[PDB]
Amino acid sequence: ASRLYTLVLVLQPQRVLLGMKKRGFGAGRWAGFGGKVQEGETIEDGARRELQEESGLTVDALHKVGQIVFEFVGEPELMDVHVFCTDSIQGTPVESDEMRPCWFQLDQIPFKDMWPDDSYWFPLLLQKKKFHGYFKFQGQDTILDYTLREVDTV
């Protein structure tokens, strides 16, 4: 019993775009851009749509980089998060009532103000590795258990 989500990292040679969510799940943390996939929509089309809605950017080709399943103890639905990256975008990042985007140099990624799982798989993303992960959370701050392995096919 899992629900489809997307997560998009705009990763350029020397910087990455992250967004500070202002409300809802994950508010107060920097993260990639994404959300729920809709009925009749491909996962990739959902990732492109969510990047636009949350950051104002238009992406062409998205590259599959990973899949991460999240379990929150006490919540029945698993989150099946399909992770994508791109280096080629159009537009300028847009701050909205819901999201504040900001560019980060790769040596200054704000892991202490990100979801704790990101410290595990961002190093793989940065070295262009693909991965499958599973994270079991207690609340939003504590990883009880996890698995993470590199793969050749997402």
Task: Write out the H or E segment, with its range, that includes residue 11.
Answer: strand 2-12
Report resolution in angstroms: 1.5
Q: Are 147 and 127 in contact (CB under 8 A)?
A: no
Instruction: Pick left, alpha or beta for residue 70 (phi over 0 → left; psi -120 to 50 → alpha; otherwise beta).
Output: beta
List the one residue out of 95, 83, 117 whose CA is nearest residue 10.
83
Cα 113–chain centre separation = 14
Q: Are 149 and 132 in contact (CB under 8 A)?
A: yes
List the one residue out of 83, 80, 76, 78 whose CA is nearest residue 62.
83
Domain boundaries, the chain: 1-154
The set of residues, in sequence order, having a beta carbon less than 8 Å from that of 45 and lying 6+ positions away, is none
Fold of 1-154: Nucleoside Triphosphate Pyrophosphohydrolase (3.90.79)
Which experimental method was this entry solved with?
A: X-ray
Dihedral, CA of residue 132, residue 151, residue 11 and residue 2, to nearest 10: -20
